[PDB]
Amino acid sequence: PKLVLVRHGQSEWNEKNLFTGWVDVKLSAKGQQEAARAGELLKEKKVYPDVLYTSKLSRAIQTANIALEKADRLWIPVNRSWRLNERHYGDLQGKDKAETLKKFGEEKFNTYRRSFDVPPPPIDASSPFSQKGDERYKYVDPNVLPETESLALVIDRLLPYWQDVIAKDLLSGKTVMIAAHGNSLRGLVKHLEGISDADIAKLNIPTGIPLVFELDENLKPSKPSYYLDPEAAAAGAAAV
Template sequence: IPVHRSWRLNERHYGALQGKDKAQTLAEFGEEQFMLWRRSYDTPPPPLADDAEFSQIDDPRYAIIPSELRPRTECLKDVVGRMLPYWYDSIVPDLSAGRTVLVAAHGNSLRALVKHLDGISDADIAALNIPTGIPLSYELDADFHPVTPGGTYLDPEAAKAAIEAVKNQGKKK
């Protein structure tokens, strides 16, 4: 099975929040700011300085990415913009050739892809939670629109429980 890797499917860059877990971020900035950064479509966290501990500016793993495209912070809108060229340039041609495509990616890059596939509004995307490690299948029509909006989880019961867990990540207990 051919494997294609792309930085365009990387997890969202959390800027100055890189290296902090959700609970730590919640405690430091409060629930309102935490949820704004975590779930809003177009509000990124503060950018990460190039000389910061978690900066990727000189990381050789990212040398393939043009420097002007290397993020210092991202919101989901940025992830959508980063992911869509991969959709159109790599995934769609494979689908057009009749190939079955498996996308293994991070939560926010998958949210970006699902937003695009399902035409989810900028406001409504905040409520979408995609569980880790539970396959989600999309059957697409000839125009690459979902036959079943939202796709189909291969294990719906596990998905339901995991979606709740994702929804509650970082929340005060």
């Protein structure tokens, strides 16, 4: 089976230096161009997805819609799940990254941003940046929607969706495309590749360049994953 992962490009809050998490902000103008590039790469390299999965956040959905327009595959069915959403940033949602760094110090800042298992403080329900009660989550058990998450917790809520729903299409022979976010894709890669809890902190997935996995019958990589544009495939950080 073949799995294609696309991380959305810059959002309007990334350009203003604000932590986003589950706040539903749109792509910036550069983000829209990165999505177009992703779709041009699917077309140039002839990777034609049969089914699309997205999160419930607009920035990843806009990305997929632009990419699939460029790759001429807009007609494919689409499924969306909260379990592919970005990590919830707790009380850091809506805060300035430079102001947060000065407030907490580099140590705490880097623990919140990149520890495997230390989540940022929980957000308050009265906060304007809380998603409690948002309409797009009204049919999910209200007790499972997070008030903060670490990457470990993202993985725990992402896996069951991979196991029962995405895997069914891969095992049926479909090429699946996932349009999602930095932490939810980092979580999935950790799982497929078997990256340790300590090393995953160092993994970065460039924005806007599709990552392909060729998997065998047990859904394990049959060869190393590869980006559709290796040169551009970025290891030099954007912000991290």
